[model samples]
Target: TLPDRFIARAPVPADAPAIARLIAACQEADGDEPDASAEEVLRDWEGLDLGQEAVLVVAPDGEAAAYADVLNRRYVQLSVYGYVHPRFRGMGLGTWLVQWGEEWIQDRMHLAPAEAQVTVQHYIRASSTSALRLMEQHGYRPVRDIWVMAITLDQPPPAPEWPEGITARTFVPGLDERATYEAVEEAFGRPPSTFERWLSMTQSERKDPELWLLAVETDSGHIVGTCLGQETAGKGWIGSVGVRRPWRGRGIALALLQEVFGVYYRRGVREVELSVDAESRTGAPRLYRRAGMHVKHRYVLHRKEIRPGIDLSTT
Candidate 1:
């Protein structure tokens, strides 16, 4: 065990700047570009009860050593996020964070339906052997791999060929908000969010109307697919892409992807990126691979079951 000078306490709003610094240090040490900002860190604390769900560890020198938060927003599947500063690695801080997270999850298991399966999950960079060993020792098993994929526009992207009887258009901000949200939620088979929550989440990032594209039926004029794009830290990001169940199996999805790629390319954005579940049920990763995007990074998700019953989380 390391010295006891490091103190752990619940995080407050003022701690966001320090925590952001800690996150940047960790990301740079992991060979990643650091784009975390104090405002972004505080924005993530929305809906979280910081006093109970988050912890911050501070060294005696007034530096943030580590940070962790237990997120229980999703029904039945609790997720925890944390980071240890590079200077503090190999100490007992990570172990303490893990133990605290397990305790926090166990204490809140009653909040979920008793008949539903409940599990605590954690995500770590797949390249981090120390984290993998730590999780294995704590009884967590690797469950899924999420990948960040990217493509560079060495040549101009192909023009989108819309499926017969379909056309693509830019999102109509004031008019298409709710319809777009419903389309994405239905496509993902996830729980519904209030319109206000949807707006708040989307507003967290800068919105560009032209970057958000929609696929509509030529005759019926109903939106069949959606592709929301944003400028992320210097790369063009395909933030969300979804197609209605009836619209699946058509070339609409890829057409929307191709259209977005071309839009970014024309705007002089050479690099475009998106994240996908490596084992997505919809075969999205393969579709992206066929489109020329390559896997750039991987994150492993680990889970520990707290109660066994019918699962409520989307697979």
Candidate 2:
């Protein structure tokens, strides 16, 4: 039986399965895919310091109804996400969770160096109207819109015509992983992350070997570009597609996409999708448009300041 009184506590590893079920229930309420796997929860539990900052709300009867976690590892933005079970919605759970989440973030902000501005933010799926209003009323402002796009695989993707010295092939696990990691990590220009950290953070059971395409320079055998593929719920997904800085103008990015898209088509998948920042500086938004992909939905990012005298307008 669901309890009338709710208690909140930080989540531990043993709570992953129950958290997964709680997240799935929240997703179904918004007409989204119940795609939160226990493995994902476990990854966050292991890879993120946010675990200590997480909030799990439980009923007196021990049923969990809400979950929220912080992400302070980012270079600037401190992201947090929380979902209240639909059955428990409109009961002040969202407001309570947001207040506590912000307080925890302010604690982190107080400890951080004041010279660098770090704002608190969250992403809301476009379809989540209630979340948008909640954040709006909570003094959060929409900062950016990220798009998830998909391409139909009924016909093969365009041919890959690599410039003279580039070769395209499937990524060999032990050998190509590090170099691909370096190329992408450097290109994306995020705060530095070790190979081990990246691997654990991206731990996936549906990873396909043949779907991991790499473009290498024939002369030096450097990994100039990479494309990782995954499949879920009867459709193909391009998990990540990137090219090194020196190779961008030479068609490496497009070639990598074509290669991964072609492989998924041959494997009998009729659809493929990927997400991208709508305001990317690398012109990726324009690049994906040429591949016959269109925006399926937009995820809005909202941010607010928790500390006084810190500028949220820095970004």
Candidate 3:
């Protein structure tokens, strides 16, 4: 019955505001405030080709019930992130939405390589039994754990202090996107095969490098340590903090974080948030704790591998 009223189509420019509001409502229903703005959503719609993106909106009797966006990557990966209006709680709208999204993704696989992996991520708090059960039933297995941490910006940041010959600066434009990209690859030890996926993401989804606080070496002038500051609706998010291998154990990351917090604090940001892999190889969770950030939530990542020449439909 729910599927009968649901229409799956490409999102139009006129649908951006409604979609943004729907997402905000979904977040609030999940016990979190809306962190994204309509302008951000509109910008994303403009940047990413929504015509190629699948959007399933369930309108019962011409009233929107739920919406979902199934994002397809050229490299054979898909992300399903969507929202269900609060009023449509138990009418099977959510299940229909998920199935519709998966079908859309499956249809696209025929146009590309035969072996494409599809993974779904769910952030299930300890209290969210329904979501946990839904994901588990759908064959999603937990693979990664993320710890969300926050730091208050009420107090003034401590004085900036760096190791000898180490200096910090804000990211500069036209400097070299490749250098920044390479730094991330080196710090992380490997690059995500779909790193270019970010380039296709909407401006709202992309992080601003200009606000990214970075530390460099005086003599070499290479980006040694860095922290990204992302602002959405007056809230600042700290992420992508990394220090090159040679510069490790020199307190460069701490210095860079302090400077970053200071910059955000001065900009009227009251709180800063970040997520660290609980089992990160680089011991990032410990570093964030030392910088006055406390864990506020936990999330589990799930994946389903797609081997070559295997038909996804058979599974």
Q: Which model scores highest in TM-score?
A: 1
Please provide, for model 1 over 123-242, each residue's C-alpha lDDT reduced to its tens digit, 9 standing for 90 to 100: 888777888888998889987778888899878887888889989988887788888878777776534677688789787442677788889888988889998898755678887777
TM, every model? 0.82, 0.73, 0.76
Report each candidate's C-alpha RMSD, comma-separated, in the order given: 3.5, 5.0, 4.9
Sorted on lDDT, highest at the top, how do the candidates line up? 1, 2, 3
Error of 1 at 91 (Å): 2.3
Give the best candidate by lDDT.
1
lDDT (0 to 1) per candidate: 0.82, 0.77, 0.66
- What are the per-model numbers of colliding residue pairs? 0, 0, 0
Off by over 4 Å in 1: 1-3, 151-156, 173-178, 190-208, 230-237, 264-272, 280-284, 290-292
lDDT of 2 by residue, 195-305 (tens): 898887556722557788888899998888888888766687776788778888887777788778888888889989998875522334677887778867678888886
- Write down the TM-score for model 3: 0.76
Model 2 clashing residue pairs (backbone):
none
lDDT for 306 in candidate 3 is 33
Q: Write the per-residue lDDT of candidate 3 for residues 24-49, one digit (tens) a residue.
A: 77777667778656677786665456
